[PDB]
Symmetry: C3
Subunit: 489 residues, 3 copies
């Protein structure tokens, strides 16, 4: 009757979520957000990166000039997308260190080809084959020049091509491996052919190997592909007594942010900074679980499929009025912290805006820092493999597996530390509001232990409102309160 | 006389341990646990992984068919190579020996299937005195040394299609004679070629004739090569001479198998983690036994010890006194408790709830430190017996980078865990003290040393009500207010 | 008049600095230190590591014996410093796997060469060339032996060199590639040549390739360099039909902490444990941003150029006397925490030494724990590249980029956690001093809410000093204080 009760409390929800800390792996909070991107639209957005769909063409086949890949001449790309349906339909070939050539062309990001006037004296040029038709006529790789004898003669070829410019040149050349000895001599006169391509700083000599190889598109012969980069001021010198597959020029080789990716995802008209073989994914989350192969500004790949970041306080279900001691207020929806009172004029409830904003601001602060930083990668290493290789592939897999486990640990520890700090900061906001009310009341109230104060004087609605507003004057009620406290009963 | 003292305190031990945080590298706690496994039984447990002891045989020698390795014909989870292993057949080398050893070890089987290669016009199964099998000239069991017949060596051209649904691993070789007389007495022609190709690959090797140092009586050598044939693909072997032919193929699989160099004996026990020093337990999150591991293992760090605090901050004990700069070495039945003095004497009782609240949080931190498994199988090599250069430099650098990053994680993790353990145990002491204050209301006063001066007659049943949490302050309020605010 | 005010407070400065935590990326503190070393003297200190300046000589040219590199015979080093001005001035050559040979010689850290008496029967030794002048007369690599025909004969060379010692031997040998067929026969009689160098465990056979290569210092011919290590008990056997560039002995190969570094920084007479291509840097900070290429005891390379570690409390600008509640004391310069009072004899201010030392000791403790040594590296991988290589180079760059991003994250998280703990420990020292004063005053004072106490009795200078010293006896003033508190006004 002659007293009033003022209780301090915090909100609670009927649909909490479980998050993790260092101590507890299952603590319930009022709200949480997902830090692992796990879904993808399924399509590769054509912005902001220049996407080049290879369709039926590998990058190497477009480089060499497979007739069905003619549409890729002089193309440029930020990301070349190789399809699993791609195929070769020209002269059967292999590339020693196929992965390295594919990688350096993918990183260069252009197929800009410049024809140079190589003068091959005494030999027939542009040899054709039935296994490489262009317009239903025998043909060959567009960027290579199959040379063979003329008038039953094959004079030693010795041709120089100096780089008098200011950019590097990429030369693609080959060596022809016949099937039989009659084939070797009908094409190159001599029974053994040498091919030597050298600069001032390097030399490469290849000896053809004659022998029956399994039929591929009707042919038992093969061609081995090689490459050579000529620096400005350096000179390209090509020397051959036979089996030379000559270049028709050079490719402009650049240094850029371009790469290549194996994917069957369709190309879509959208904008997304991050691309995976599953399609583009958003980068609003710090981590992702779609694919370890990424291109562009991406979240970091982790092994966990979900990592829940607490964005509210610990959810304590609700138990006269009572305070926050082992009791949450599911009826308080307009704020995270508030006051419940009971006086002579009834009861009421009001939220505290400052302490509510103080907790939201700290959580929005962790979010802005969790969604920050730079993981924008371009050409990296390969991470899936279709053949068994051994040592080099063992090291490539180990590096990536080591990397993923280290970032999985970082993500796991980061969320647990963030959640514990979120729990502590929200618990401190409740304590700071309780202690601020204690200091206002001075000797006019007593801590009841359950988060409520027993105010030892008649405190009407204007009096309760002054405590909530922070304008409570304890000298006004001190004499009345001291009498109610220290009275004999 | 008319008052009583009630003190809050925590336990203390006479044998504390020193742990580290970020501020203090040497803070004493009541108890600690070791997070780094440093010891090993010394033996490799034969469970749960299928262990294959190589004894005197390397994996490559068992693959090719060294006569003293015949017992390895046709599986393993881990092949254990001994340092006492030796070769006792035809002297040989393997270009990219490490990769072939790796892919066979990863496949985890030596299942060999004979195929009927028909070699027309040549003599098969050539033997040598440097590869005796039963005291007779012999050769690698899985290879077929071909040479001339009737002073003729017609060009070999043999196809072997893969009409099945699994991959085939073919192991073949090329023979390098010592002199020209040897080259022609065996292969007629003065030079030779071996070409093994599929639809997607080709390998051509030219023999090299020349004197090489004597090894088991022979100056000649054999270079070993391999080729994988996919289903639908075709193996084609073309040779002018010096061909060491395969007798079939090895079934190549994709599994969790690996290989390890170790001299540790095999034991009849069960252990998920194997190191070259022997199996180690995986009850701790980190280990310092060996960076080479197989199975579900703790992560390798450089530190030999990392102590995780499992008890509160140890304060030696200095009338009764509270917890302020004072621990209670006499309290053995609990971590926190009450000491009182009234008209009926003194007493001490522990608080079970706060004691369990601190133990549960420490058991909670423990659980989470033995959860996220590190189960690796075939990896990279981490020790090397020859100088190689660029590739070996990268392999060492990768492993050294990894160990330094996990060593930092382990160092930071324990320091953060210990600081939180110190803070949570300090908060349990403060919460019990604040819980007691709220019960006493205006019937007591904080003496500053963790004790309360209770300003009323509080007998044993009254002290017990404070400890149980059923203390009624209205009963003693009038008496207490008279003792507090008296002149 | 009959009362006194005692305020608890902390210091503040007019020149605060901004540090980062997990919540706030911009919190102002009174003092901070830089954890990233970003500057360098620009010179390489010649202590404590033995520095060998290569000047005009690459390590490979000093190994082979380029005449202008004669001053490097039998040299030793902890770090070989290659200058960009280096050049070759002998027979034009190439090294298959040049990077691996350069690496293993650099790691061995010595060029100690021991001449061995190879007996080459029937051939002329020490062939010279105009492209390798030594003292203005035709010469050759000092450590190699160019063999050619004698009396128009080149009998098959078959020479053994057993390792009868207890250390490994490093043999450097070569193969000569002529330009024309007449050159091949004028020097080696036969039209082709084989070179086979083998031990009991390895064999290497090289076939020369005849052909025109671009002119380098007047010559179209080349020499390919190879190496072989012979273990104790093993035997070196050299078999050659022609074109052999023979060794004159072996290099002692060691296992040490030596390495090689490309740098143009000048050598200086100073002492520094850490060396970068930019020069020596101090290792007083845990992280550095000068160069990812390091040698010796170094800070760890990160991407951030600055990381400020808070070394003081949160700086709160100063707003009767008032306490620490939303108020710092810029007038307190002799301590971090202190007392401000007002009694009948005036006002005063005094610092608290114990709480000030308790906060400084914890901060000095964190500083020391950040300089514990785990990064002393020597020979590592290469991290810059002047040519395009592909797969192996991609993996080398990816490994280093993976490493830097992981340590950059560690540094970022470490400083944010350290700063938050420093803020928490400095705030706790302020609260503990306030609660310590509360316990002394008992019922003789009341918490005013702003960090000050209202002392309800006459408390002169000797009485205030007892509270500051910790020897305040509340029983002396209890009766006087109770009458002032619970009086009717
Ligand atoms: C060395 O042996 C191989 C394998 O026995 C021989 O290759 C085979 O050559 C025949 C043609 O002479 C190929 O047959 C053709 O097959 C196609 C489609 O299968 C068919 O349309 C043609 O009418 C013809 O039958 C056969 O594919 C091919 N086998 C392989 C695996 O490529 C090779 O000719 C022999 N070489 C010498 C020099 O003896
Ligand atoms: C080229 O020179 C090498 C080096 O001398 C010759 O190899 C050597 O060949 C002899 C052949 O009689 C080997 O001798 C044998 O040594 C064993 C082992 O102790 C001994 O028990 C035998 O009774 C015999 O004396 C010698 O070991 C071997 N040395 C090496 C390093 O392999 C080779 O014969 C020469 N070839 C030509 C074409 O000149
Ligand atoms: C194959 O073609 C190359 C390219 O023409 C020939 O090499 C060239 O040979 C000439 C004459 O030996 C070199 O000329 C010399 O050039 C220097 C300038 O550095 C000049 O001062 C000399 O007086 C002389 O003119 C020319 O530099 C050289 N070119 C290159 C790129 O190396 C080679 O001779 C041909 N081989 C055959 C077998 O025909
Ligand atoms: C809980 O329910 C409310 C009401 O629809 C909803 O707005 C909120 O996002 C839910 N959140 C969770 C994580 O359950
Ligand atoms: C719940 O948390 C997420 C993460 O911050 C936030 O996006 C959302 O607005 C929050 N919801 C509530 C119910 O206010
Ligand atoms: C790709 O190949 C398919 C099937 O051969 C053909 O229908 C299609 O036109 C090709 N696409 C292009 C762009 O050439
Ligand atoms: C993403 O794609 C890869 C195969 O392209 C697959 O292994 C993975 O499970 C996919 N998952 C999601 C969520 O996209
Ligand atoms: C302290 O001694 C007890 C009793 O012998 C023992 O059980 C306990 O494990 C010891 N603890 C430490 C940290 O030494
Ligand atoms: C290799 O195994 C055989 C067969 O037991 C044995 O006699 C020989 O001495 C072994 N070598 C060892 C065990 O060092
Ligand atoms: C185990 O590993 C190697 C040899 O296996 C060597 O360092 C030592 O003998 C052992 N060290 C440890 C820590 O067990
Ligand atoms: C000390 O800690 C360990 C692990 O937390 C526990 O197994 C052990 O029994 C503890 N000892 C005591 C006396 O608490
Ligand atoms: C602030 O100014 C003083 C006065 O020169 C100086 O000693 C101190 O280092 C400065 N601190 C900061 C953080 O600027
Ligand atoms: C390096 O070569 C240049 C040019 O010939 C010469 O002037 C200089 O003195 C040389 N330096 C040394 C240290 O021999
Ligand atoms: C260190 O050297 C490299 C190469 O000159 C340069 O890119 C980098 O900016 C330099 N940084 C400093 C701080 O000297
Ligand atoms: C500022 O911090 C540094 C690092 O702790 C310390 O050396 C210096 O004494 C501090 N300066 C002041 C004015 O306290």
């Amino acid at each position: 009757n002659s007293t009033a009760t003022l209780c301090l409390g915090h909100h609670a929800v009927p649909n909490g979520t479980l998050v993790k800390t260092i101590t507890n792996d299952q603590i319930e909070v009022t709200n949480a957000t997902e830090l692992v991107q796990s879904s993808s639209t399924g399509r590769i957005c054509d912005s902001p990166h220049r996407i080049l769909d290879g369709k039926n063409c590998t990058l190497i086949d477009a480089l060499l000039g497979d007739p069905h890949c003619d549409g890729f001449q002089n193309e440029k790309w930020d990301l070349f997308v190789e399809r699993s349906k791609a195929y070769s339909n020209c002269y059967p070939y292999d590339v020693p260190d196929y992965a390295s050539l594919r990688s350096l062309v993918a990183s260069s990001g252009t197929l800009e080809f410049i024809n140079e006037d190589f003068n091959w004296i005494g030999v027939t040029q542009s040899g054709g084959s039935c296994a490489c038709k262009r317009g239903s006529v025998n043909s060959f790789f567009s960027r290579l020049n199959w040379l063979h004898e003329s008038e039953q003669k094959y004079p030693a070829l010795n041709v120089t091509m100096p780089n008098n410019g200011k950019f590097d040149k990429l030369y693609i050349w080959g060596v022809h491996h016949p099937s039989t000895d009659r084939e070797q001599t009908n094409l190159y006169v001599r029974a053994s052919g040498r091919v030597t391509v050298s600069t001032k700083r390097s030399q490469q000599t290849v000896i053809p190997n004659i022998g029956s190889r399994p039929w591929v598109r009707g042919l038992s012969s093969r061609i081995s592909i090689y490459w050579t980069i000529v620096k400005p001021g350096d000179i390209l010198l090509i020397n051959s007594i036979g089996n030379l597959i000559a270049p028709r020029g050079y490719f402009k080789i650049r240094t850029g942010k371009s790469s290549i990716m194996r994917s069957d995802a369709p190309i879509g008209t959208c904008s997304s900074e991050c691309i995976t073989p599953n399609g583009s994914i958003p980068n609003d989350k710090p981590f992702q679980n779609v694919n370890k192969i990424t291109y562009g500004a991406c979240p970091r790949y982790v092994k966990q499929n979900t990592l829940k970041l607490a964005t509210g306080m610990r959810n304590v279900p609700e138990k006269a009025i009572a305070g926050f001691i082992e009791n949450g207020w599911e009826g308080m929806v307009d704020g995270w912290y508030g006051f419940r009172h009971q006086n002579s004029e009834g009861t009421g409830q009001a939220a505290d805006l400052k302490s509510t904003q103080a907790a939201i601001d700290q959580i929005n602060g962790k979010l802005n820092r969790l969604i920050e930083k730079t993981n924008e990668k371009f050409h990296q290493i390969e991470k899936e493999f279709s053949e068994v290789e051994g040592r080099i592939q063992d090291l490539e897999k180990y590096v990536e597996d080591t990397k993923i486990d280290l970032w999985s640990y970082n993500a796991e520890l980061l969320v647990a530390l963030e959640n514990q700090h979120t729990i502590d900061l929200t618990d401190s906001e409740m304590n700071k509001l309780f202690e601020k009310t204690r200091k206002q009341l001075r000797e006019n109230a007593e801590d009841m232990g359950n988060g409520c104060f027993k105010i030892y004087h008649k405190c009407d609605n204007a009096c309760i409102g002054s405590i909530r507003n922070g304008t409570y004057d304890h000298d006004v009620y001190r004499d009345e309160a001291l009498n109610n406290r220290f009275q004999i009963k």
